Structures are given as C-alpha cells and as structure tokens.
C-alpha cells in the first residue's frame, strides 16, 4: 500500500541490461507499485528496435477490417462492428490518410481528446484489428511479443496486429481471463489510453451495469463484448478514479490483471499485442467472471497443480476462499523488495 499510493500510471526507462529479461522487469515494475494503476508505460533503450524497416508490408493482408459504428450521447456509447472484406495495409493506409478519415488539425492533446468525444458517433472509421501476426524480426530476443516465454506457455499467447486510423477505438475491458497484456506501437500516430486502478474495477462494473441494465441481465461480464465506451467526464461525474496516458511510436504499454482500459488512435498506426502471465495472475484467472452468453476460457487446473499444490485439492472442492489483494506485487518481486 506504500508503493504508488496515488495509483497513477507509471513510466519506466530500462537500460539495455535491465531490458534483456522481460519477466524480471515486470517483477521490478510491480515492486515499484506500477500494477496499482492497472497500466504502465515502458520506453525501451534507444538502440533497441524490433525490425529494421516497415517498407515491405504493403501487401500484408488485414483479413477482417472492422467499420466502427458508435451510438450514444452524454458520455455513454455502444460500439457495433461491421466486418468488411479483406484489405491490404496499402489500401488501409490510403483510406486512413485520405481527407475523409485523416486526423483533424489540433494544437494540444486535450483539443484532440475533445474532438474524439465530440465526433465519436460520426463518419465511422475502419479498424484493421486482430490480425494474427508479428512485425518482430526472427533474431530479436528482447521483449519479443511473439515469444515472451512467461508461465502462460503452459496453456491467447499468440501475437495480433492492429492497424489504426483516426478515431478507431477500443472499448472498456480487462484482458481475457483477467490476464496481463503487452502492446508495442510499431509506427505511426499515437494511441491514447484510459485506465481504472484494479482496486476500483468493481466501481466501473457497477456503473456500467447501472447504465446498461439489459446487457447486464443477458451477460454477467457484458464489458468483455468490448462494445462499451464511457467518457472521462462521465467517470468524473460518478467518482470513478482513472488516469490517462498517450503511447507514442516505439513505446510499450503493459496492462495488469483486472486493469480496465479503453482508448483511441490519433491517426494511422500499427500496434502489436499479446497476453502474458506471472505467478500473481493465477488467483485472478481462478476468480475471473467470464462472458456466459458466447469466449476465451483457460483451464486453471494446470496452474493450480504446479504453483498452488497445497491449495489444489482444496480449490477443486470449491473451498479456496482466497481474497485478492490488488496492491500486492507478484511473488517474483521479492529480490527487489
Ligand atoms: O489498441 C487496441 N486495439 C484493439 N484492441 C486492444 C486491446 N484488446 C483487444 C483484445 C481482444 C483480443 N482478442 C484476440 C480478440 C484485448 N485487449 N487492448 C488494448 C489496446 C487495444
Ligand atoms: Zn486490452
Ligand atoms: Zn457475454
């Protein structure tokens, strides 16, 4: 509780030596209380690059671009997807940068954030989302989203590319199975993020359930449909604590177990993402409320038998009454504490 009491989004600048061990660095940022915010930024060493150039990806296929139709008013919105036929990065970039879809003129991020929440429902953009693949070169061993080699490998552990344009969005959600996530912004215009501290996650859900009663009756985890957009002003009006951060090209974002996040793309960009885990996630995975209507489901037995043997028979019987302390860092953070 003494580390990051404010539960603000923290930014880290590892050296090349510190950067070489992924899992150890996550253990480090947790010892500093980075997890309390639910979101952290890692700016890698200047010399590190996962690929020499991105000039050879014009004919990369985006199998399922999605047109994002948003409906709503007064800070509350629902986003509907319209799957379009496959398109190439070249075709996507032409559309992203055209007069119809390009980023508007602005001076400060605050002005662009205002234009986003003002025009979210107009001129629906296209998101080249969830493309199976990696933009990492084969020889890259540091922070390779393709091969993190965390405890999740015991199994959602494959990489996805997201090609964004101005105003494309990701709705409020937590990772599948309340897992961790890593997001690398390969190139292009920034990506803005909002996060709710895991310790206040239940407050967001209670607010979401109050505003979408129909959705709440149909599903016990309706936010996992990733359709719900709620503005910072609406979170402020209902006392939901949150923080905001802008991710720029060449920066990593780490999301933590039960860390609610949302956000939007400033313009044409490309991000790579995957889920991962630490010993700390096991309890989150066991207690995750899943979409019952409807999805991604990991069997927790293999994790419990290996990392909680003393509790394995107790848990299988439905007697593991363990209550999660969101402020506690991962056990692997011991060497830093
Ligand atoms: O920028 C983002 N775009 C799009 N999605 C984002 C995102 N997430 C998307 C998923 C779903 C993944 N499965 C595969 C479908 C989970 N999180 N989390 C953060 C940022 C983004
Ligand atoms: Zn996410
Ligand atoms: Zn559902």
From Swiss-Prot:
Sites where the protein binds Fe cation: 173, 175, 261
Give the protein's recorded name. Answer: Lysine-specific demethylase 4A
Residue positions binding 2-oxoglutarate = 127, 183, 191, 226
State which tissues express it: Ubiquitous.
Role noted for this protein: Histone demethylase that specifically demethylates 'Lys-9' and 'Lys-36' residues of histone H3, thereby playing a central role in histone code. Does not demethylate histone H3 'Lys-4', H3 'Lys-27' nor H4 'Lys-20'. Demethylates trimethylated H3 'Lys-9' and H3 'Lys-36' residue, while it has no activity on mono- and dimethylated residues. Demethylation of Lys residue generates formaldehyde and succinate. Participates in transcriptional repression of ASCL2 and E2F-responsive promoters via the recruitment of histone deacetylases and NCOR1, respectively.
Name the gene.
KDM4A
Q: What is the effect of changing residue 133 to A?
A: Abolishes histone demethylase activity
Q: Which family does it belong to?
A: Belongs to the JHDM3 histone demethylase family.
Task: Please spell out the taxonomic lineage of the organism that makes this protein.
Answer: Eukaryota, Metazoa, Chordata, Craniata, Vertebrata
């Amino acid at each position: 509780e003494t580390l990051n009491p404010s539960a603000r989004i923290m930014t880290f600048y590892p050296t090349m030596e510190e950067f070489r061990n992924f899992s150890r660095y996550i253990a480090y940022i947790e010892s500093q209380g980075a997890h309390r915010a639910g979101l952290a930024k890692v700016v890698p060493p200047k010399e590190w690059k996962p690929r020499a150039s991105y000039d050879d990806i014009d004919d990369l296929v985006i199998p399922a671009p999605i047109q994002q139709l948003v409906t709503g008013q007064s800070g509350l919105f629902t986003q509907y997807n319209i799957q379009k036929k496959a398109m190439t990065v070249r075709e996507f970039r032409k559309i992203a940068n055209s007069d119809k879809y390009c980023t508007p003129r602005y001076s400060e991020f605050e002005e662009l954030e205002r234009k986003y929440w003002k025009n979210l429902t107009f001129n629906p953009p296209i998101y080249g989302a969830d493309v199976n693949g990696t933009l990492y070169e084969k020889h890259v061993d540091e922070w390779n989203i393709g091969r993190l080699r965390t405890i999740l490998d015991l199994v959602v552990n494959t990489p996805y590319l997201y090609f964004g344009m101005w105003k494309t969005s990701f709705a409020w959600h937590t990772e599948d199975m309340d897992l961790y996530s890593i997001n690398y912004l390969h190139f292009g215009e920034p990506k803005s993020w909002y996060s709710v501290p895991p310790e206040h996650g239940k407050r967001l859900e209670r607010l979401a359930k109050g505003f979408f009663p129909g959705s709440a009756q149909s599903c016990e985890a309706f936010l996992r449909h990733k359709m719900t957009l709620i503005s910072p002003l609406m979170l402020k009006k209902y006392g939901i604590p949150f923080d905001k951060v802008t991710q720029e090209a060449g920066e990593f974002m780490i999301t933590f177990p039960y860390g609610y996040h949302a956000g939007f793309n400033h313009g044409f960009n490309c991000a790579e993402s995957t889920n991962f885990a630490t010993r700390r996630w096991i309890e989150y995975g066991k207690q995750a409320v899943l979409c019952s209507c409807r999805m991604v489901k990991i069997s927790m037995d293999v994790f419990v038998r290996k990392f909680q043997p003393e509790r394995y028979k107790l848990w299988k019987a439905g007697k593991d009454n363990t209550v999660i302390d969101h402020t506690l860092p991962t056990p692997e953070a011991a060497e830093f504490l």
